[PDB]
């Protein structure tokens, strides 16, 4: 079974940038490779077939190349609607194999995150569960770091981060980190802090509150 090694995995480019994606074959698939694209939310579209043959209607800013085992997809002018996922599909032999895929995101200047922290509601505590959330709004690049600390005690394996998709308008990101304790544990701790680390911040900022049920 021929294996397609796609690279890179992630790529951040600016509008009008010339980008190139590569996919190397283990075995000689000689010409039998296609390029696909999956727009956010699901839609998949066949861009190129036969390594360099563009599907009718596919913009001329897309082209396919081959250098030995390496097959490349190249986009001349990176237009906004090119923010999607690309995969190389081998079809020389069965089974058909894909490439890991490349996620091309929009590049922009470093945006320091806006941080907020929310204590659990009284009504929730009544049901035992105590959820705590830390919101990091509109930041970039996506690489963040939320260290939950209760009474300075670093927390682990008790929080779930969730990242919003890059905003169309300003290309920023948003992250929600939810900490989950039990009304028992929760009520036995006072200070609940959230420490965020981002390259857009000189020092790791922290937001906290004291357990004072209101």
């Amino acid at each position: 079974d021929i294996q397609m090694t796609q690279s890179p995995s992630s790529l951040s480019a600016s509008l009008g940038e010339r980008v190139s994606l590569t996919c190397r074959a283990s075995q000689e698939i000689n010409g039998y490779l296609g390029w696909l694209q999956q727009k956010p939310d699901g839609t998949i579209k066949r861009l190129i077939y036969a390594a360099s043959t563009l599907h009718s209607g596919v913009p001329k800013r897309f082209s396919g190349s081959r250098s030995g085992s390496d097959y490349s997809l190249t986009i001349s002018s990176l237009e906004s609607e090119d923010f999607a996922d690309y995969y190389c599909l081998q079809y020389a032999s069965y089974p058909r194999t894909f490439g890991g895929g490349t996620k091309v995101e929009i590049k922009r200047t470093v945006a320091a995150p806006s941080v907020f922290i929310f204590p659990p509601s009284d009504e929730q505590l009544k049901s035992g569960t105590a959820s705590v959330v830390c919101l990091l709004n509109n930041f970039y690049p996506r690489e963040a770091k939320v260290q939950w600390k209760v009474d300075n005690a670093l927390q682990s394996g008790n929080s779930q981060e969730s990242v919003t998709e890059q905003d169309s308008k300003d290309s920023t990101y948003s992250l929600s980190s939810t900490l989950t304790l039990s009304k028992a544990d929760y009520e036995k701790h006072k200070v609940y802090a959230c420490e965020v680390t981002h390259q857009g911040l000189s020092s790791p900022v922290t937001k906290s509150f004291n357990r004072g049920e209101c």
Partner: protein
């Protein structure tokens, strides 16, 4: 135009089997034969197998043999992806593609879980923490312990769109889902504007509205 119709979202229990369909409009399976691909949540595309009804041929990647079964009804221009002995590992999205992958269908979501349809529990992510108006504030709604997906979160019945962030759902250890819809609002409005989150969850037929107000927390 000519496209690929795919079956609806499926929610099955671990152990059973499923049968997904894909119908072609215009072009038939004889000429444009089908491919079935899988894609686990936030992962890559995995080729499962394919069928060439004309030659009564069927291919499968070694990892799907026996576990997946593709059959095509010539008259209906419909192939069928059959998946047996389902486990959590099967929860994913499956797409059908025709000959040469010219056309791809919208994909059907399969969810394998032991859990059941449960309405969400909406809680307020109250503002005014270490503050009292002034500058920019943030509030939202915590939509937790619901199944299956998804939930639709509107703000003020669709009136407030700017600054709203409805994060992707997070699967919890209990097998239930949870998410948050935070909203960035001016701090000055915190007592002169009512913010309501309209959470809807069709599967349970739940429709709730949670009012988030400032608290000196």
């Amino acid at each position: 135009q000519v496209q690929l119709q795919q079956s609806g979202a499926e929610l099955v229990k671990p152990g059973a089997s499923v049968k997904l369909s894909c119908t072609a409009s215009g072009f038939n399976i004889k000429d444009t034969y089908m491919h079935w691909v899988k894609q686990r949540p936030k992962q890559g595309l995995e080729w499962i197998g394919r069928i060439d009804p004309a030659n009564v041929d069927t291919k499968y990647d070694p990892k799907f043999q026996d576990k997946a079964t593709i059959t095509a009804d010539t008259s209906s221009k419909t192939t069928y992806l059959q998946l047996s002995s389902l486990t959590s590992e099967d929860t994913a999205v499956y797409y059908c593609a025709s000959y040469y992958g010219i056309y791809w269908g919208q994909g059907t979501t399969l969810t394998v879980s032991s859990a059941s349809t449960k309405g969400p529990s909406v809680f307020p992510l109250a503002p005014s923490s270490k503050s009292t108006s002034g500058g920019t504030a943030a509030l939202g709604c915590l939509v937790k312990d619901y199944f299956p997906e998804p939930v639709t979160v509107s703000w003020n019945s669709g009136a407030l769109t700017s600054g709203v962030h409805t994060f992707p759902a997070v699967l919890q250890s209990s097998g239930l889902y949870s998410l948050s819809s935070v909203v960035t609002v001016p701090s000055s409005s915190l007592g002169t504007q009512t913010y309501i989150c309209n959470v809807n969850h069709k599967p349970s037929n739940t429709k709730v509205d949670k009012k988030v107000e400032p608290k000196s927390c």
